[PDB]
Each structure stands twice: as C-alpha cells, then as structure tokens.
Amino acid sequence: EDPWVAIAKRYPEGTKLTGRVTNLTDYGCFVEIEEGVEGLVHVSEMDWTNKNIHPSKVVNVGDVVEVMVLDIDEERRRISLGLKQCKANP
RNA sequence: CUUACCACUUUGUGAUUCAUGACUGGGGUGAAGUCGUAACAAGGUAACCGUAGGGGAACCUGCGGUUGGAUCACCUCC
Ligand SMILES: [Mg+2]
Ligand SMILES: [Mg+2]
Ligand SMILES: [Mg+2]
Ligand SMILES: [Mg+2]
Ligand SMILES: [Mg+2]
Ligand SMILES: [Mg+2]
Ligand SMILES: [Mg+2]
Ligand SMILES: [Mg+2]
Ligand SMILES: [Mg+2]
Ligand SMILES: [Mg+2]
Numbered sequence: 001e002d003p004w005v006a007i008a009k010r011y012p013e014g015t016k017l018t019g020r021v022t023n024l025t026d027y028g029c030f031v032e033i034e035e036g037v038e039g040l041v042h043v044s045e046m047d048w049t050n051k052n053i054h055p056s057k058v059v060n061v062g063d064v065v066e067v068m069v070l071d072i073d074e075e076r077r078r079i080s081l082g083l084k085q086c087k088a089n090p
Numbered sequence: 091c092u093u094a095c096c097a098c099u100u101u102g103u104g105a106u107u108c109a110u111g112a113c114u115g116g117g118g119u120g121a122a123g124u125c126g127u128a129a130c131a132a133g134g135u136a137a138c139c140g141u142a143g144g145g146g147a148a149c150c151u152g153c154g155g156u157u158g159g160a161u162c163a164c165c166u167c168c
Binding site for chain 2: 023028040077
C-alpha cells in the first residue's frame, strides 16, 4: 500500500543494493529484501556470456547479491535489477 | 266428394368423395455416362444453425449465433 508511492528512495538508475533472492525462474531470479517490494534482474544480465547462463547456475535460492536498480516502472509496478554490473567490467 | 300428413318422382344450387387429364413440380432406385470437387485431416477459405441476396451444379457472399474447430498469441514479474 505505502512503499510504491515514495519510490524516489532508491529511484536513481545509479543506486545499488544488497538484496536476497526468493526463487528462480529460467528468465531471472527476483531479489527481494526491500519487503512488499521485489526486483527481477533478467537472465540477459547476471553474466557476461548473455544467456549462456541458467539463473540456477550463477545464483541459488536464499543468497544475497549486490545489484543496481536500472529501471523503476512506478506504474505497472516493476523494478529492473542488474547483477552482471555490480562485479567486473571485462 | 273434400282437407291434413306422407312414399315414388321432379327442379335449382352447394358440400364431400372416388376415378381419369394435355402439361408440369419435385422424390426414390440404378456396376460402367458428362460436368466438376461441396463435406470428413487446419479437407486445402474450420464447419454448422437462422435469415437475405447471387450463381450450370455441388455451392458462394453478407449479418448475428454455436463449438459439435486443428495449431493456438507474442521478449520480463513467480
Ligand atoms: Mg435424381
Ligand atoms: Mg473440398
Ligand atoms: Mg452441409
Ligand atoms: Mg488454414
Ligand atoms: Mg472447406
Ligand atoms: Mg480450394
Ligand atoms: Mg436462397
Ligand atoms: Mg457472389
Ligand atoms: Mg459466418
Ligand atoms: Mg446465445
């Protein structure tokens, strides 16, 4: 009810977190510490081998990971996290 | 002798019913004829129902309806 309205808090694309994953998909993972709030980070990201990476492979459930916010969709209510960025730039 | 009632019988106009009739509508059956291929597979434009218009023929097209229809819907929110 409350949290989505004042989502300025971590709005800036540059902002980064450490959140904890809930479950995996095969297109992402979802990393949800913010509580009542949850990102995704798509399988495109998480690696520098594009999709040559199953989410299960790089990360597993109940596992904390550093991530930047990239895109918040105020309405439609969906945040786009990035995991390949908060670690190396080879 | 006469009046009344009344059978035979006569006339007029209807109803119903059987037969027959130039010509004409469709229906059934038929190894091997002609024209095509409408349906059954997504039957090669999914089919079908009501209705309307059109076309040698099966049919075609419009409007609404039905599933008694294959394959079924798009990058990332559980
Ligand atoms: Mg015939
Ligand atoms: Mg046919
Ligand atoms: Mg028919
Ligand atoms: Mg077809
Ligand atoms: Mg057909
Ligand atoms: Mg055809
Ligand atoms: Mg007709
Ligand atoms: Mg026509
Ligand atoms: Mg129709
Ligand atoms: Mg109805």
